[PDB]
CSV table of all heavy atoms in Angstrom, one decimal:
chain,number,residue,atom,x,y,z
A,1,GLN,N,-125.6,66.5,15.5
A,1,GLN,CA,-126.6,67.3,14.8
A,1,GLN,C,-126.3,68.7,15.0
A,1,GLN,O,-125.8,69.2,16.0
A,1,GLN,CB,-128.0,67.0,15.4
A,1,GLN,CG,-129.1,67.5,14.7
A,1,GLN,CD,-130.4,67.3,15.5
A,1,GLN,OE1,-131.2,66.3,15.1
A,1,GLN,NE2,-130.9,68.2,16.2
A,2,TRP,N,-126.7,69.5,14.0
A,2,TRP,CA,-126.7,70.8,14.0
A,2,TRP,C,-127.7,71.4,15.1
A,2,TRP,O,-128.8,71.1,15.2
A,2,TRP,CB,-127.0,71.3,12.6
A,2,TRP,CG,-128.0,70.4,11.8
A,2,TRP,CD1,-127.5,69.4,11.0
A,2,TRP,CD2,-129.4,70.5,11.7
A,2,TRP,NE1,-128.6,68.7,10.4
A,2,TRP,CE2,-129.7,69.5,10.9
A,2,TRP,CE3,-130.4,71.3,12.3
A,2,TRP,CZ2,-131.1,69.2,10.6
A,2,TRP,CZ3,-131.6,71.1,12.1
A,2,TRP,CH2,-132.1,70.1,11.2
A,3,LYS,N,-127.1,72.2,16.0
A,3,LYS,CA,-127.8,72.9,17.1
A,3,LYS,C,-127.3,74.2,17.1
A,3,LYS,O,-126.2,74.6,16.9
A,3,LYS,CB,-127.7,72.2,18.4
A,3,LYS,CG,-128.4,72.7,19.6
A,3,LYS,CD,-128.1,72.0,20.8
A,3,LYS,CE,-129.0,72.6,22.0
A,3,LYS,NZ,-128.7,74.0,22.2
A,4,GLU,N,-128.2,75.2,17.3
A,4,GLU,CA,-127.8,76.5,17.4
A,4,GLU,C,-126.8,77.0,18.2
A,4,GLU,O,-126.7,76.5,19.3
A,4,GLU,CB,-129.1,77.4,17.5
A,4,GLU,CG,-129.8,77.5,18.8
A,4,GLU,CD,-130.2,76.2,19.4
A,4,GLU,OE1,-131.2,75.5,18.9
A,4,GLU,OE2,-129.7,75.7,20.3
A,5,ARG,N,-126.0,77.9,17.7
A,5,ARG,CA,-125.0,78.4,18.5
A,5,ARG,C,-125.4,79.7,19.2
A,5,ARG,O,-125.1,80.1,20.3
A,5,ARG,CB,-123.6,78.8,17.8
A,5,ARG,CG,-122.8,77.7,17.3
A,5,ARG,CD,-121.5,78.3,16.7
A,5,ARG,NE,-120.6,77.2,16.1
A,5,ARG,CZ,-119.2,77.5,15.9
A,5,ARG,NH1,-118.5,78.6,16.2
A,5,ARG,NH2,-118.4,76.5,15.3
A,6,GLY,N,-126.5,80.2,18.4
A,6,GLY,CA,-127.1,81.3,18.8
A,6,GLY,C,-127.9,82.0,17.7
A,6,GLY,O,-128.1,81.4,16.7
A,7,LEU,N,-128.2,83.2,17.9
A,7,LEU,CA,-128.9,84.0,17.1
A,7,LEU,C,-128.1,85.4,16.8
A,7,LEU,O,-127.4,85.8,17.8
A,7,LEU,CB,-130.2,84.5,17.6
A,7,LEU,CG,-131.3,83.4,18.1
A,7,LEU,CD1,-131.6,82.5,17.1
A,7,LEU,CD2,-130.9,82.8,19.4
A,8,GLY,N,-128.0,85.8,15.7
A,8,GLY,CA,-127.3,87.0,15.6
A,8,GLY,C,-127.5,87.7,14.2
A,8,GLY,O,-128.5,87.7,13.6
A,9,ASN,N,-126.4,88.3,13.8
A,9,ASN,CA,-126.3,89.1,12.6
A,9,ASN,C,-125.1,88.7,11.9
A,9,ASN,O,-124.0,88.6,12.6
A,9,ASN,CB,-126.1,90.6,12.9
A,9,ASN,CG,-125.8,91.5,11.7
A,9,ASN,OD1,-126.8,92.0,11.1
A,9,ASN,ND2,-124.6,91.7,11.6
A,10,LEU,N,-125.2,88.3,10.8
A,10,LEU,CA,-124.1,87.9,9.9
A,10,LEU,C,-123.6,89.1,9.4
A,10,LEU,O,-124.1,89.9,8.6
A,10,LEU,CB,-124.7,86.9,8.9
A,10,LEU,CG,-123.7,86.3,8.0
A,10,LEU,CD1,-124.3,85.0,7.4
A,10,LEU,CD2,-123.2,87.2,6.8
A,11,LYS,N,-122.3,89.3,9.7
A,11,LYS,CA,-121.6,90.4,9.3
A,11,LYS,C,-120.7,89.8,8.2
A,11,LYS,O,-120.1,88.8,8.3
A,11,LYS,CB,-120.7,90.8,10.5
A,11,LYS,CG,-120.1,92.1,10.5
A,11,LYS,CD,-121.1,93.1,11.0
A,11,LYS,CE,-120.5,94.5,11.4
A,11,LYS,NZ,-121.4,95.4,12.1
A,12,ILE,N,-120.6,90.6,7.2
A,12,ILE,CA,-119.7,90.2,6.1
A,12,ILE,C,-118.6,91.1,6.1
A,12,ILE,O,-118.7,92.3,6.0
A,12,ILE,CB,-120.4,90.3,4.7
A,12,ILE,CG1,-121.4,89.1,4.5
A,12,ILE,CG2,-119.4,90.3,3.6
A,12,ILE,CD1,-120.7,87.8,4.3
A,13,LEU,N,-117.5,90.5,6.2
A,13,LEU,CA,-116.3,91.1,6.0
A,13,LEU,C,-115.7,90.7,4.7
A,13,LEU,O,-115.5,89.6,4.4
A,13,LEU,CB,-115.2,91.0,7.2
A,13,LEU,CG,-115.6,91.6,8.6
A,13,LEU,CD1,-117.0,91.0,9.1
A,13,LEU,CD2,-114.6,91.3,9.6
A,14,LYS,N,-115.2,91.7,3.9
A,14,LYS,CA,-114.7,91.5,2.7
A,14,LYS,C,-113.4,92.1,2.5
A,14,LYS,O,-113.2,93.3,2.8
A,14,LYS,CB,-115.6,92.0,1.6
A,14,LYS,CG,-115.1,92.1,0.2
A,14,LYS,CD,-116.0,92.8,-0.8
A,14,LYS,CE,-115.4,92.8,-2.1
A,14,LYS,NZ,-114.1,93.7,-2.1
A,15,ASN,N,-112.4,91.3,2.2
A,15,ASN,CA,-111.0,91.8,1.8
A,15,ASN,C,-111.1,92.9,0.7
A,15,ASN,O,-111.9,92.6,-0.2
A,15,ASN,CB,-110.0,90.8,1.6
A,15,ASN,CG,-109.5,90.1,2.8
A,15,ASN,OD1,-110.1,89.2,3.3
A,15,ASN,ND2,-108.4,90.6,3.2
A,16,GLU,N,-110.2,93.8,0.8
A,16,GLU,CA,-110.0,94.8,-0.1
A,16,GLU,C,-109.4,94.2,-1.3
A,16,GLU,O,-109.6,94.7,-2.5
A,16,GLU,CB,-109.0,95.8,0.5
A,16,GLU,CG,-109.7,96.6,1.5
A,16,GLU,CD,-110.3,97.8,1.0
A,16,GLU,OE1,-111.4,97.7,0.4
A,16,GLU,OE2,-109.8,99.0,1.0
A,17,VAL,N,-108.7,93.0,-1.3
A,17,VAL,CA,-108.3,92.3,-2.2
A,17,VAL,C,-109.3,91.4,-2.9
A,17,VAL,O,-109.3,91.1,-4.1
A,17,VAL,CB,-107.2,91.4,-1.5
A,17,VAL,CG1,-106.9,90.2,-2.4
A,17,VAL,CG2,-106.0,92.1,-1.2
A,18,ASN,N,-110.4,91.3,-2.1
A,18,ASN,CA,-111.6,90.5,-2.5
A,18,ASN,C,-111.1,89.1,-2.8
A,18,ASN,O,-111.7,88.2,-3.6
A,18,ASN,CB,-112.2,91.1,-3.8
A,18,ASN,CG,-113.4,90.5,-4.4
A,18,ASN,OD1,-114.5,90.6,-4.1
A,18,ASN,ND2,-113.2,89.8,-5.6
A,19,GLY,N,-110.1,88.6,-2.0
A,19,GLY,CA,-109.6,87.4,-2.1
A,19,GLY,C,-110.3,86.4,-1.2
A,19,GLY,O,-110.8,85.3,-1.6
A,20,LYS,N,-110.5,86.8,0.1
A,20,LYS,CA,-111.3,86.1,0.9
A,20,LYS,C,-112.4,87.1,1.6
A,20,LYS,O,-112.1,88.2,1.8
A,20,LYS,CB,-110.5,85.6,2.1
A,20,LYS,CG,-109.4,84.5,1.6
A,20,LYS,CD,-108.6,84.0,2.8
A,20,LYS,CE,-107.6,83.0,2.3
A,20,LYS,NZ,-106.6,83.4,1.3
A,21,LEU,N,-113.5,86.5,1.7
A,21,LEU,CA,-114.5,87.2,2.4
A,21,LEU,C,-114.9,86.3,3.4
A,21,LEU,O,-114.9,85.1,3.3
A,21,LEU,CB,-115.7,87.5,1.5
A,21,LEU,CG,-115.6,88.5,0.3
A,21,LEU,CD1,-114.7,87.8,-0.9
A,21,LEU,CD2,-116.9,88.9,-0.2
A,22,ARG,N,-115.4,86.8,4.4
A,22,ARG,CA,-116.0,86.1,5.5
A,22,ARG,C,-117.3,86.5,5.9
A,22,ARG,O,-117.8,87.7,5.6
A,22,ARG,CB,-115.2,86.5,6.8
A,22,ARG,CG,-113.9,87.4,6.6
A,22,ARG,CD,-112.8,86.6,6.1
A,22,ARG,NE,-111.7,87.5,5.7
A,22,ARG,CZ,-110.9,88.3,6.5
A,22,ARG,NH1,-111.0,88.2,7.8
A,22,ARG,NH2,-110.0,89.1,6.0
A,23,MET,N,-118.0,85.6,6.5
A,23,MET,CA,-119.2,85.8,7.1
A,23,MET,C,-118.9,85.5,8.5
A,23,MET,O,-118.5,84.4,8.8
A,23,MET,CB,-120.1,84.7,6.5
A,23,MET,CG,-120.2,84.6,5.1
A,23,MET,SD,-121.6,83.6,4.5
A,23,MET,CE,-121.5,84.2,2.7
A,24,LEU,N,-119.2,86.4,9.3
A,24,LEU,CA,-119.1,86.1,10.8
A,24,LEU,C,-120.3,86.6,11.4
A,24,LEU,O,-121.0,87.4,10.9
A,24,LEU,CB,-117.9,86.7,11.5
A,24,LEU,CG,-117.6,88.2,11.5
A,24,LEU,CD1,-118.5,89.0,12.6
A,24,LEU,CD2,-116.2,88.5,11.8
A,25,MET,N,-120.7,85.9,12.5
A,25,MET,CA,-121.8,86.2,13.0
A,25,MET,C,-121.6,86.3,14.5
A,25,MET,O,-121.1,85.4,15.1
A,25,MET,CB,-122.9,85.3,12.6
A,25,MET,CG,-122.5,83.9,12.8
A,25,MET,SD,-123.5,82.8,11.7
A,25,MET,CE,-122.9,83.3,10.1
A,26,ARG,N,-122.0,87.3,14.9
A,26,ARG,CA,-122.0,87.8,16.3
A,26,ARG,C,-123.4,87.7,16.7
A,26,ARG,O,-124.3,87.9,15.9
A,26,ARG,CB,-121.6,89.3,16.2
A,26,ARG,CG,-121.5,90.1,17.5
A,26,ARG,CD,-121.1,91.5,17.1
A,26,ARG,NE,-120.9,92.4,18.3
A,26,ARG,CZ,-121.2,93.7,18.2
A,26,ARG,NH1,-122.1,94.1,17.3
A,26,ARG,NH2,-120.7,94.6,19.0
A,27,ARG,N,-123.5,87.3,17.9
A,27,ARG,CA,-124.7,87.2,18.6
A,27,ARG,C,-125.1,88.5,19.0
A,27,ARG,O,-124.3,89.1,19.6
A,27,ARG,CB,-124.5,86.1,19.6
A,27,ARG,CG,-124.2,84.7,19.2
A,27,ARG,CD,-124.0,83.8,20.3
A,27,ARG,NE,-125.1,83.5,21.2
A,27,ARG,CZ,-125.1,82.9,22.3
A,27,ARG,NH1,-123.9,82.4,22.8
A,27,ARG,NH2,-126.2,82.6,22.9
A,28,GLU,N,-126.2,88.9,18.6
A,28,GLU,CA,-126.7,90.3,18.6
A,28,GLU,C,-126.8,90.9,19.9
A,28,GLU,O,-126.0,91.7,20.3
A,28,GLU,CB,-128.0,90.4,18.0
A,28,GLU,CG,-128.4,91.8,17.4
A,28,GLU,CD,-129.8,91.7,16.7
A,28,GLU,OE1,-129.8,91.2,15.6
A,28,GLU,OE2,-130.7,92.2,17.3
A,29,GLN,N,-127.6,90.3,20.7
A,29,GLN,CA,-127.7,90.8,22.0
A,29,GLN,C,-126.5,90.2,22.9
A,29,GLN,O,-126.4,90.6,24.1
A,29,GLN,CB,-129.1,90.6,22.6
A,29,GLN,CG,-130.3,91.1,21.7
A,29,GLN,CD,-131.6,90.8,22.4
A,29,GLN,OE1,-132.1,89.8,22.1
A,29,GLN,NE2,-132.0,91.7,23.2
A,30,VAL,N,-125.8,89.3,22.4
A,30,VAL,CA,-124.8,88.6,23.1
A,30,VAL,C,-123.4,89.3,22.8
A,30,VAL,O,-122.4,89.1,23.4
A,30,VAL,CB,-124.9,87.2,22.6
A,30,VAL,CG1,-123.6,86.4,22.9
A,30,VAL,CG2,-126.0,86.5,23.1
A,31,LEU,N,-123.4,90.4,21.9
A,31,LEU,CA,-122.4,91.2,21.5
A,31,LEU,C,-121.1,90.4,20.9
A,31,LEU,O,-120.1,91.0,20.6
A,31,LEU,CB,-122.1,91.9,22.8
A,31,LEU,CG,-120.9,92.7,22.8
A,31,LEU,CD1,-121.1,94.0,22.1
A,31,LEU,CD2,-120.3,92.8,24.1
A,32,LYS,N,-121.3,89.2,20.9
A,32,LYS,CA,-120.1,88.3,20.4
A,32,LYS,C,-120.2,87.4,19.2
A,32,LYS,O,-121.0,86.5,19.2
A,32,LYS,CB,-119.9,87.6,21.8
A,32,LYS,CG,-118.6,86.8,22.0
A,32,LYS,CD,-118.8,85.3,21.4
A,32,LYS,CE,-117.6,84.6,21.7
A,32,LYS,NZ,-116.4,85.1,21.2
A,33,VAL,N,-119.5,87.8,18.2
A,33,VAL,CA,-118.9,86.9,17.0
A,33,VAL,C,-118.6,85.5,17.5
A,33,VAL,O,-117.7,85.4,18.4
A,33,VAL,CB,-117.8,87.6,16.3
A,33,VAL,CG1,-116.8,87.9,17.1
A,33,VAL,CG2,-117.5,86.8,15.1
A,34,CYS,N,-119.3,84.6,16.9
A,34,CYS,CA,-118.9,83.2,17.2
A,34,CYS,C,-118.3,82.4,16.1
A,34,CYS,O,-117.6,81.5,16.3
A,34,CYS,CB,-120.2,82.5,17.7
A,34,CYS,SG,-120.8,83.0,19.4
A,35,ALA,N,-118.5,82.9,14.9
A,35,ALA,CA,-118.0,82.1,13.8
A,35,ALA,C,-117.6,82.9,12.7
A,35,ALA,O,-118.4,83.7,12.1
A,35,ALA,CB,-118.9,81.2,13.1
A,36,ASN,N,-116.4,82.8,12.3
A,36,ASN,CA,-115.9,83.5,11.2
A,36,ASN,C,-115.6,82.5,10.1
A,36,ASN,O,-114.6,81.8,10.1
A,36,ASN,CB,-114.5,84.1,11.5
A,36,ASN,CG,-113.9,85.0,10.3
A,36,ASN,OD1,-114.1,86.2,10.2
A,36,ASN,ND2,-113.1,84.3,9.5
């Protein structure tokens, strides 16, 4: 089952090529990106 990894801010990184974009999320108060 899906269980939270945490809480954060989804950061979008987008290639200049606009080929791949990513959504990564760092845990806000945890200062740490967990998923790209």
Side-chain angles (χ1 to χ4, degrees):
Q1 189 187 271
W2 29 271
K3 184 183 182 299
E4 69 302 293
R5 287 190 182 195
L7 302 310
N9 173 89
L10 182 167
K11 201 80 164 186
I12 286 289
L13 293 61
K14 169 186 176 299
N15 278 88
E16 284 280 70
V17 159
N18 177 84
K20 296 179 179 61
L21 296 68
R22 351 284 171 67
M23 309 190 166
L24 60 79
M25 50 205 70
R26 179 183 183 216
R27 297 175 63 186
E28 205 178 283
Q29 303 180 270
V30 164
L31 171 78
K32 187 277 184 301
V33 61
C34 293
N36 183 94

